[PDB]
Amino acid sequence: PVDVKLEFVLYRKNVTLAELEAMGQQQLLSLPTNAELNVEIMANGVLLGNGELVQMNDTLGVEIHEWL
Amino acid sequence: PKMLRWPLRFVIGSSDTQRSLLGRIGIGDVLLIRTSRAEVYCYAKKLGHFNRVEGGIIVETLDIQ
Ligand SMILES: [Cl-]
């Protein structure tokens, strides 16, 4: 009975036609050192919360720092 | 007029859950990434994959449609 797709978003950025061209190459986009400590968690479009990337046993996940 | 923007998401994962198991979720709970990716999205379109490096991100061949 599964409804929703949760998305784990490391980084978002609004981007210009210029900066778009520059990435079609292989030019580096600069993330802070601290990106993995605010991974946005998005359901079908909307932002639900935010958290640090964690590893439990086999899998990866996001320990929730803030929510709804 | 070239004052245009595209909103990009750097997605590292997906998980299918039940709309009814949140907000049973609160702070401290771990949500697991069942499907693991490194794709770039613009709205629904996937544009291509990306590699995380010490500076941030480098993107492989990125689609433009
Ligand atoms: Cl898919």
Author numbering:
A (entry chain B): 2 to 69
B (entry chain A): 5 to 69
How did the manuscript describe this experimental structure?
Type III secretion systems (T3SS) allow the transport of protein substrates directly across the double membrane of Gram-negative bacteria. Proteomic analyses have identified the major components of the sorting platform for the Salmonella typhimurium SPI-1 injectisome: the AAA+ ATPase InvC, its regulator OrgB and the proteins SpaO and OrgA4. Here we show that a novel, heterotypic interaction between SPOA domains serves as a scaffold for sorting platform assembly in both injectisome and flagellar T3SS. Our structures suggest a partial model for the subtype-specific assembly of the T3SS sorting platforms: the heterotypic interaction between SPOA domains within a given T3SS subtype functions as an adaptor for ATPase and its regulator through interaction with the APAR peptide.
While SPOA1 alone was insoluble, constructs containing both SPOA1 and SPOA2 (residues 140–297) were stable and soluble. This complex crystalized, and its structure was determined to 2.9 Å resolution. SPOA1 and SPOA2 form a distinct, heterotypic SPOA–SPOA interaction with an overall topology similar to that of the SPOA2 homodimer. The SPOA1 backbone follows that of the prototypical SPOA fold, retaining the antiparallel beta-sheet floor and fingers-to-palm architecture. In both SPOA1,2 and the SPOA2 homodimer, interacting protomers each bury about 1,800 Å2 against their binding partner. SPOA1,2 and the SPOA2 homodimer superpose with 2.47 Å r.m.s.d. , and the conformation of SPOA2 in association with SPOA1 is grossly similar to that seen in the homodimer, superposing with an r.m.s.d. of 1.67 Å. The existence of heterotypic SPOA interactions provides a structural explanation for the observed ∼1:3 stoichiometry of SPOA1 to SPOA2 in SpaO homologues. We show here that the third SPOA2 can be stabilized by a SPOA1–SPOA2 interaction.
